[PDB]
Each structure stands twice: as structure tokens, then as C-alpha cells.
Amino acid sequence: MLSKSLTLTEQVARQIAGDIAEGVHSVGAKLPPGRVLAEQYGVSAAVIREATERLRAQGLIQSRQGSGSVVVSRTGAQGFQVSAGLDDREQLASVYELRMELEGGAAALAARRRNATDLAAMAEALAALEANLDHPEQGVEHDIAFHVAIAAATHNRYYQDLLQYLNLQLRTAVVHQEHVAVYDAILAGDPDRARLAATRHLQQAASRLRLD
Amino acid sequence: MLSKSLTLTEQVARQIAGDIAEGVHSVGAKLPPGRVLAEQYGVSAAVIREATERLRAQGLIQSRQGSGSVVVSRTGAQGFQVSAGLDDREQLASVYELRMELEGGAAALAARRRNATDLAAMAEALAALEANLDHPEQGVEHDIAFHVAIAAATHNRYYQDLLQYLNLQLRLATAVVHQEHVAVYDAILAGDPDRARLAATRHLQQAASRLR
Amino acid sequence: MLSKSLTLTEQVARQIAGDIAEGVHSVGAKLPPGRVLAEQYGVSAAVIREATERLRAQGLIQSRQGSGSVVVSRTGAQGFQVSAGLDDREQLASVYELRMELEGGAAALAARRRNATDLAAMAEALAALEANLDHPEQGVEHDIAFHVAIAAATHNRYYQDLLQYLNLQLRLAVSTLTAVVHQEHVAVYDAILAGDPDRARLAATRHLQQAASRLRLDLLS
Amino acid sequence: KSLTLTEQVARQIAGDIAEGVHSVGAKLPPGRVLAEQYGVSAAVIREATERLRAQGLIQSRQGSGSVVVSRTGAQGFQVSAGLDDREQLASVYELRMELEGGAAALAARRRNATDLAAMAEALAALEANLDHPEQGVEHDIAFHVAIAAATHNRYYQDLLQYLNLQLLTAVVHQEHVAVYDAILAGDPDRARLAATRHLQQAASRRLD
């Protein structure tokens, strides 16, 4: 009652996931039915279906209808990097410099990939940015949502997200003119000028924050 | 093969993920009673309760039985790993793209930060690449180890940690090739920032036209 | 809702009907037999086995127990909307995104062509509508005719076929006030009595761009 | 050979549908009661209930079951490829004029990379057969389909494909490209424009 007791849903997982690394149901073998896990665990259809997604999501098992479920990686390959907000020098310079290659290379694609509706998102976004130059406490979201728009303009369904993450880290006129420059570059459909003024927008930012 | 379709379950989590990434549901913020999300996203709670779990496993929300679902993150369990496979040579190509973008500045930021053993690794396998110009199966464990150098030469783990993972799951699912593998060695080892970015891009983009 | 990502069954035919129309299975040819077809697209026995019979009612090919299946045509028994399903909101939001652009031109032709016989029913049904913004259910029987006879004002029986079909399934589809609805309806008529192509093109578009905004609002309400 | 066990149901069913038994909006009995009302295999049903879907009497949610949506089927024909040409065909050409109008516009606000793929490749499959115009018809076939696809709308592109299934070059291409670059520029109203000139012209070429 008092503390978040592990409900069955989660409990059933750590039973099964153990076996994936305890060696029982080896890699590529077929997990049992659901009707059996119900019996094996005295739980119900509903609970089973839920727990299964715990394993698909942590990337240890997959499924197709009718076949059942295939195990993949005993560990569970749920692994990437980059935190957000906790300051620790030079390792910080290992990341911004990375996005410099990234923020520029993305806008270099939108120079061949922005359409009308893409600009319409970047439109009110920078329009929402210019409307709070005196209030920089609101334009965070849009400094993202504008930076965001360059990824949405990349039309790369994957690339988009990897960017989409990076920004969601924690943390006036000199800040905003580096922006509308890459717009008149993305507006133009200009390849390297978008790859530039973007890299330069972050170029100044990464040393301006090293001065913070 | 065909593109593996998407369940309601995971299309729900992805579109709710974005609804978290666009800060519509910020941290501390409870989430709509799923009974509304059924009506909103159109399904029945069967899939709701499932998609729910996909999150609480990728670590984006928690819920307490009684007190609704609460958001507390915008980062994922790890980052994001496309499963790729036969799913979309398109969404797969949505990476060869970026894996070369990275490899643009990657060869570059080595050319300004290339050590001895860096280039002395770039050469050790460069010899084992030469003789194995007639062992096109022994010379496999070389081409990556080659590109690895550039990445390890960056002295930037994030940058380096990132690409390995990309390269890694990429291969999950020599004459003109080695000449093309070569043109960057003169580029990295001669202080040329963009010429390293230049002939390296020439590499993978030929190989992609070698594959596509 | 969202994109009811299709059944492999129908995901298949909509590559095979396309493959047929790609001519790569030029008519009179025998399709690669079932054994092959699973592996080509990567599906099971009862998918092909099904997606086949979709072509045997769509009539694209005929099958003979032993010979196999021979493409006998590249066009079906007509074109068909193929939707109106519960939970097909992305499929439905793909419907309205056409009858619109249609009912924009289905005013332009009516703006360039007409009798009074068109403007007969036009003022007739709008009158049958104006006097009946009070029993919001009987007037549904007339939003047909106004929209219907607006197409009749175009004088193209194959246009008139198109709309009446699409219109058919939406009435079947949304198997669930009248003032701001009746206004926009008249707004088309004004640019069509005074006869104006590009003026009625918009005001018609606005009707659908407003009546569907009073449809994507009640579903999530 | 008589009618298949499969069809022996489809045209046994449409009766009880059109005989108001399985009235519209009612749930079709489950794919287990049918084999148990009929004495066939449950794996027969899947085809029968695949006929009635493409025959537009029903659709089904993967849990609720199957529900009829018509009592006969409103197929909605538009047959022929020639004869009675006069302007009856030109009225068809009048229709498609607006669809080619609306469609290209929708390519300009949401085209993608896979869009400019064959749209540039069918523009390239066409430009190299300008003096072999018995070959590029298959491309003027497909080049439309290409941008027709860029709608991402199943039905839009799709029911456009069927018309091109009813039966100089240095010019009609200049109209093919003016529309092309519009979506290639993302200008939607210019997309709806630079297209139909192509369509207004080949039909003016009714004179044939």
C-alpha cells in the first residue's frame, strides 16, 4: 500500500528477463505462448500483453503475429549516451562541437528539403521567437521549436529524433541574428550557406557559453 | 521484404513521445485519463495500457494506481535505435546519409586532432588492407577499424561513442575501394580540415552508389 | 484517430494491383505462383490466399486450380473509395481532403455552366433548408440535393457520378448549429447566381473547410 | 467447375444482406459461427470475408468483428477507353483537369525525398525518349503516378491511376517540368497552376 509495490505487470517481466540472461530461453528461441505464461504465473491475459511490451521496448525481444516472440539480446541493448544539464567541462566541449557537425549538416539537407508547410512551422516559430526578444524566459521552447523545425525539415524520419533528443537538454539580439540568417539560407534552398550560418550560430554559442 | 507494419501500440507511444518532446506534457504534469486517450487517439484501453508500459520501460513517465500518469523526462531509455532490417531501405538510407554527415566533420576534427598511434593505427591496418586486396573476406575486419581510427582519433568519446553504435547496428541487418579509402589519409595527415571531410564523403557516397 | 496501417492481405494486393498496372505482369500473363509470392513480399500462406481473392472480386486476375492465376485486366469493376471504417480517421481525413478540391472545381464548372434548372433546385433546397434550421435532421435530406444539384449545375454526368458515390459513403460513414452552416451554403450560391468561377471555388472550399472543422471537433469532444 | 466453397458463401451472403437479414450496421456473425453454420473451414471464411471487403459490403475492426456497410455494393462504374469520343472523353478530360490541379498542389506542401526520387527519375526516363514517343507513354503513364503518389493520399493517387488505364514531346515536357519545379520549389498554388497548362494543352491537342 504505502510504497509503490511492484505490480504484477512489472514483476512478471523481471522473472522472464532473468531467463533471457539466466540462459533458459536462449537467443533466437521461441518464448512460450501467452496462455502458458498466464498459467505459469497465475496472472491474466491483460497483464501478459503489457509485460511483453516491457521486453519489446527494452529491446530484448521482438514479435510477429502468429509466430510468437523471438529473443534478441540477453543484456538488452537499451544503450546510447548524452545526459542533459549536469555541467562538467571539456566533456561539454566533446558534445557541442558534435552538434556543430550536426546542426549544420541538418540545415544543409533542408536546403533541398523544406516545403511550404515546413516553413509554416518555422514561420510562427521564429515569429514566436521575435515576439519575446525582451522576454528570453519564454523563447526557450521556440529556440528549440525553431531549431526543431530544421530537423523536421530534414525529412529524415530517423535523423530528426536524434536531434529531437539532443536539444531537450537543460541549460539577445546577438543570439537571434545567427538564426534568421540560416532561415534566409533554408528559405533560399542554399546548400552550404545553411551548413555555414548554422555551424557559425553554434560556433559563437559554444565559446559564448564557455564564457559563462 | 515488406516494411514491418506498426501496431496501434507503438504508433501511440511514438506520437505521445512527440507530444512529450513538444513539451505539451511537461514534467510533474499528470497525463490525461487513458479513457480520454482512447477517445483522443482512437482505440480501446487494451492498447492504452500497453502503450503506457512501452513508456514506463523506456523511462518517460511513471504512474501511481489511483493518481493518474505523471511525466518525468524527455530523454529516452538510451537514445533511439532503429530496428532497420527489411523495414525501410528508405529509413535505412535515412542513416547512410547522416553516417556520412558525421563522417564529414569526423575526418575533419581528426585532421586537427590526429595523434601518432591514431595515424599509426590508420597505417597498421592500411598494410593489412594492401595484402588482403586478394582476401576480400579476411579484409573485412579492417574497413571499420580504419574508420574507427578517425573516430578514436577525435579524442571525443560522445562523438566516438555515437558513431560506433551507428556503424555497429548498421552491419547488423578493393582496388578502387582502397584508393578511395586512401585519399583521406593524405587529407587527415596533412592538416587539411575540409579535404579530410572531402575525400571521406567521396568514400561512403561511392560505396552507397556501389550498393544502391 | 490515425493511420490504420493496412493488412498485409490488402498491403499485398495494393502492390500486386500496382504491379499489374505497372504492366510488369502484362495482361494474359501468369502471376508468379503462390509459393514464390510469399517470399517475394515476405508473408504467410493465409495472406496471399486472401489477397488473391481480393483480386478475384476486384477481377484483376482469374485463377484455375492447376494453371494458377492469369491477369485478365488492368482495371477493376469501377473505382471505389474503400473506407468509411470505424477508426479510419486518417483514412477518412484522406477522404475529405479530396471531395473538397473536387467541390472546388465542382463549383467552377457550375460557375461557368448552368440553366435556371440548377438555380431552381439551388434556391429550392436552400429554401427547404432555410425554413428548416429548426428540426436539425430532416434538413439532412436537403444538404444532399443542394450539394447534389450543385454538381448538376456542371453538366458532366461523370462528375455527377463521382460526387454521388463519395457522398454516399460519408452519409454511411459518420453514422453518429444549422445557422452558420446554412450561411456558407448560400455563400457558394451568391458567387454562382452572379456567376463567378474563382469566387465560388473558395466559398465552396470554405464550406468543407468549416463543416469538417465541426467534425474533427465533435469526435474529440 | 462450379462455384468455389468460398464464393458459395459470398453470393450466399449478399442475399441475406440484401434480404435485410444481415441488415446494415449489424455485426456480421463471427468467423467461427459461420463455419459452424455452414460446415466449412474457418480458413475458408477469410477469403469470403476478403471478397465482401473489396466488394464494399463490410469492413472490420480487429476485435469487434465485421459490420456490413451496404446491402448491394455501390461499385460505381466509369468504363471504356474509346468510342463516342466527340467531347464525352473531353468531359473526362475536363474532370481530370482539376484533379491534376489539386494533386500537384498537395505535392508542393508535403513532398519528400522518395517523392523527388522517381519524379526526377521518371522525368529522366522521359527526357531520353523524346524522339521515341511510342515509349514515353508508359512514362507519361508513370510520371503522373509519381507526383500522384506525392499526395501520400492512398485514394487520391490510386483512383488517379485507374484513369491512365484508359487508352510533340519537346513541348508537352516543358509543361511536365514547369509543374515539376513548382513542387520542387514547394509553391502550392504555382503547383496547382504550372500543371494544368499541360492538361489544358494536350486536350486542346480534342482536335486530334
Add this chain to the structure above:
DNA sequence: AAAGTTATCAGATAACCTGAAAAGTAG
């Protein structure tokens, strides 16, 4: 305490799988 969420059980119907037993025609 009662209104309102999450979590779980009870009972069920459509997709999609795998393989063997019929029923046929192209060799």
C-alpha cells in the same frame, strides 16, 4: 464518504502463422 484513476480479471473476435491432406492441371 464519494467521484474518478489506474491496474486486473473474464470473455471474446479478427489478422496472421505453420503444415498436412485434397484437388486439381502442365511435365
Add this chain to the structure above:
DNA sequence: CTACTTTTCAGGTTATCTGATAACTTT
């Protein structure tokens, strides 16, 4: 004859429904 494909059975798991019940927090 064998060998190739088509239509059927039988026996199977997954997705996704829809209803109630249970445990718990909110108000």
C-alpha cells in the same frame, strides 16, 4: 507416371476488442 500449382481441412498464437472487477487516490 512424377512434379507443379491451386483449393481445403485441422490445430495455433498474436494482436486488438469490450465488459467488469478490484485496489487506490483523488476530491
